[PDB]
């Protein structure tokens, strides 16, 4: 046949893949972590968004750190041979490199390691997307008025769509959901049939950066801004359509 191009991930496997959504709203009293009002709005929005993209969505609520690790391990041991991709969404408290179970922290590297190129072989070469709504620290953004080869890296083909910049808090509205997840679902709804995923996430960055600003009776937390951060180790373009 004719000349062929391969700069995009193959997304026409029989199934798009799993979308695992871990929604941690209520935390054990002993941890002292506050309940995350509005996170159910995020979880429902993500479920509908990924359903329309033809993902097999599984929603999990209020998981302990042990349950998160066991879930991720079990999912990574499934046969994904017939699936194009894998998506995991984490909605919780966090700090840099850490996501909270209801009873304590989970190392993000531990979770993602289950899906490494050498450890989940049915996902080797396929995009593994981790979408994270959680704090990455406690900084606030004040804003400003305007030969060939035969191996691939085991860390290749991951993308971390993080709600906020490294070191910073991430904002969630108790009524509307988190700024990032609201924006992500809106941009996926409007553009998943039109734009490559990096370009969609860039529009999410713009929406969060331009349309939201915090309101607080506490001057320390008032009038603050947020920029999400895309961390891409993908090796091809990702279109949700084919």
């Amino acid at each position: 046949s004719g000349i062929s191009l391969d700069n995009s991930y193959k997304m026409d496997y029989p199934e798009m893949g799993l979308c695992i959504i871990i929604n941690n709203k209520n935390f054990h009293k002993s941890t002292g972590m506050t309940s995350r009002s509005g996170t159910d709005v995020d979880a429902a929005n993500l479920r509908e968004t990924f359903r329309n993209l033809k993902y097999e969505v599984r929603n999990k609520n209020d998981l302990t750190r042990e349950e998160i690790v066991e879930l991720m391990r079990d999912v990574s041991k499934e046969d994904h041979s017939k699936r194009s991709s894998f998506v995991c969404v984490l909605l919780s408290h966090g700090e840099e490199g850490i996501i909270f179970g209801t009873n304590g922290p989970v190392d993000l590297k531990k979770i993602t390691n289950f899906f490494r190129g050498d450890r989940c072989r049915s996902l080797t070469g396929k995009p593994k997307l981790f979408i994270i709504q959680a704090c990455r620290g406690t900084e606030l953004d004040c804003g400003i008025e305007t030969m060939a080869c035969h191996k691939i890296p085991v860390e290749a083909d991951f993308l971390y769509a993080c709600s906020t910049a490294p070191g910073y808090y991430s904002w969630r509205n108790s009524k509307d959901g988190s700024w990032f997840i609201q924006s992500l679902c809106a941009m996926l709804k409007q553009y998943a049939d039109k734009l490559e995923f990096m370009h969609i996430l860039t529009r999410v960055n713009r929406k969060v950066a331009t349309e939201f600003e915090s309101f607080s009776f506490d001057a320390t937390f008032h009038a603050k801004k947020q920029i999400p951060c895309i961390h891409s180790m993908l090796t091809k373009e990702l279109y949700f359509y084919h």
């Binding site: 995350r36 509005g38 966090g94 991430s170 904002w171 969630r172 309101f215």
Partner: peptide, 4 residues
Amino acid sequence: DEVD
């Protein structure tokens, strides 16, 4: 508005 709340932080995570």
